[PDB]
């Protein structure tokens, strides 16, 4: 005797020793990315090509 | 006995040991950018190619 068995219920595992089908379908995907930047450019100039007389000493 | 079980209510975890499916769907994206600039150009000139006599001393 295997005990009471439901008639219309779907066949499910209920006790120790019962079998069950596992459909292994795994799809995992993780990603991450980052960046940082900094820039600085500086140019400066001053030139006196021709200096008038009253400015010579300066 | 597994206690009272609702008939029409959706199957939800209610007690310790109940299982729940988490659909991991994360999509985070942050960005920032900035810039600054400054420029200055100056040219000046004065020339006396031909100086009249009354202006010579000056």
CSV table of C-alpha atoms in Angstrom, one decimal:
chain,number,residue,atom,x,y,z
A,1,UNK,CA,0.0,0.0,0.0
A,2,UNK,CA,1.3,3.4,-1.0
A,3,UNK,CA,-1.3,5.4,0.9
A,4,UNK,CA,-3.9,7.8,-0.3
A,5,UNK,CA,-3.2,9.3,-3.7
A,6,UNK,CA,-5.3,12.3,-5.1
A,7,UNK,CA,-7.0,11.7,-8.4
A,8,UNK,CA,-7.1,15.1,-10.0
A,9,UNK,CA,-4.3,16.9,-8.2
A,10,UNK,CA,-1.0,17.4,-10.1
A,11,UNK,CA,1.7,14.9,-9.3
A,12,UNK,CA,4.0,16.6,-6.8
A,13,UNK,CA,6.7,15.3,-4.5
A,14,UNK,CA,5.2,15.0,-1.0
A,15,UNK,CA,7.4,12.6,1.1
A,16,UNK,CA,11.0,11.7,1.5
A,17,UNK,CA,12.3,9.8,-1.5
A,18,UNK,CA,10.0,11.4,-4.1
A,19,UNK,CA,11.5,12.7,-7.3
A,20,UNK,CA,11.3,16.2,-8.9
A,21,UNK,CA,12.6,17.6,-12.1
A,22,UNK,CA,14.8,20.7,-11.9
A,23,UNK,CA,15.3,22.7,-15.1
A,24,UNK,CA,18.6,24.5,-14.5
A,25,UNK,CA,18.3,27.9,-16.3
A,26,UNK,CA,20.7,30.5,-14.8
A,27,UNK,CA,21.6,33.7,-16.5
A,28,UNK,CA,23.3,36.3,-14.2
A,29,UNK,CA,25.2,39.3,-15.5
A,30,UNK,CA,26.5,42.3,-13.5
A,31,UNK,CA,28.7,45.2,-14.6
A,32,UNK,CA,30.1,48.5,-13.3
A,33,UNK,CA,32.4,51.2,-14.6
A,34,UNK,CA,33.5,54.7,-13.6
A,35,UNK,CA,36.0,57.3,-14.5
A,36,UNK,CA,37.2,60.8,-13.5
A,37,UNK,CA,39.4,63.4,-15.1
A,38,UNK,CA,40.8,66.9,-14.4
A,39,UNK,CA,42.8,69.3,-16.5
A,40,UNK,CA,44.3,72.8,-16.1
A,41,UNK,CA,46.3,74.8,-18.7
A,42,UNK,CA,47.7,78.3,-18.1
A,43,UNK,CA,49.8,80.5,-20.2
A,44,UNK,CA,50.8,84.1,-19.5
A,45,UNK,CA,53.2,86.6,-21.2
A,46,UNK,CA,54.1,90.2,-21.3
A,47,UNK,CA,56.7,91.9,-23.6
A,48,UNK,CA,57.8,95.5,-24.3
A,49,UNK,CA,59.2,95.4,-27.8
A,50,UNK,CA,59.8,99.2,-28.0
A,51,UNK,CA,60.0,101.2,-24.7
A,52,UNK,CA,59.6,105.0,-24.8
A,53,UNK,CA,62.2,107.0,-23.1
A,54,UNK,CA,60.1,108.2,-20.2
A,55,UNK,CA,59.3,104.5,-19.5
A,56,UNK,CA,62.8,103.2,-19.9
A,57,UNK,CA,63.7,103.2,-16.2
A,58,UNK,CA,60.6,101.1,-15.5
B,1,UNK,CA,-1.1,21.0,10.0
B,2,UNK,CA,0.2,24.1,8.2
B,3,UNK,CA,-2.5,26.5,9.6
B,4,UNK,CA,-5.0,28.6,7.8
B,5,UNK,CA,-4.3,29.2,4.1
B,6,UNK,CA,-6.3,31.7,2.0
B,7,UNK,CA,-8.0,30.3,-1.1
B,8,UNK,CA,-8.1,33.3,-3.5
B,9,UNK,CA,-5.3,35.4,-2.1
B,10,UNK,CA,-2.0,35.5,-4.0
B,11,UNK,CA,0.7,33.3,-2.6
B,12,UNK,CA,2.9,35.6,-0.5
B,13,UNK,CA,5.6,34.9,2.1
B,14,UNK,CA,4.0,35.4,5.5
B,15,UNK,CA,6.2,33.6,8.1
B,16,UNK,CA,9.9,32.8,8.8
B,17,UNK,CA,11.2,30.3,6.3
B,18,UNK,CA,8.9,31.3,3.4
B,19,UNK,CA,10.5,31.8,0.0
B,20,UNK,CA,10.3,34.7,-2.3
B,21,UNK,CA,11.7,35.4,-5.8
B,22,UNK,CA,13.8,38.5,-6.3
B,23,UNK,CA,14.3,39.7,-9.9
B,24,UNK,CA,17.6,41.5,-9.7
B,25,UNK,CA,17.3,44.4,-12.2
B,26,UNK,CA,19.6,47.3,-11.3
B,27,UNK,CA,20.6,50.1,-13.8
B,28,UNK,CA,22.2,53.2,-12.2
B,29,UNK,CA,24.1,55.8,-14.1
B,30,UNK,CA,25.4,59.2,-12.8
B,31,UNK,CA,27.6,61.8,-14.5
B,32,UNK,CA,28.9,65.3,-14.0
B,33,UNK,CA,31.2,67.6,-15.9
B,34,UNK,CA,32.3,71.2,-15.8
B,35,UNK,CA,34.8,73.6,-17.3
B,36,UNK,CA,36.0,77.2,-17.1
B,37,UNK,CA,38.2,79.5,-19.2
B,38,UNK,CA,39.5,83.0,-19.4
B,39,UNK,CA,41.5,84.9,-21.9
B,40,UNK,CA,43.0,88.3,-22.4
B,41,UNK,CA,45.1,89.7,-25.3
B,42,UNK,CA,46.4,93.2,-25.5
B,43,UNK,CA,48.5,95.0,-28.2
B,44,UNK,CA,49.5,98.6,-28.3
B,45,UNK,CA,51.9,100.6,-30.5
B,46,UNK,CA,52.8,104.2,-31.4
B,47,UNK,CA,55.4,105.3,-34.0
B,48,UNK,CA,56.5,108.6,-35.5
B,49,UNK,CA,58.0,107.7,-38.9
B,50,UNK,CA,58.5,111.3,-40.0
B,51,UNK,CA,58.7,114.0,-37.3
B,52,UNK,CA,58.2,117.7,-38.3
B,53,UNK,CA,60.8,120.1,-37.1
B,54,UNK,CA,58.6,121.9,-34.5
B,55,UNK,CA,57.8,118.5,-33.0
B,56,UNK,CA,61.4,117.2,-33.0
B,57,UNK,CA,62.2,118.1,-29.4
B,58,UNK,CA,59.1,116.2,-28.3
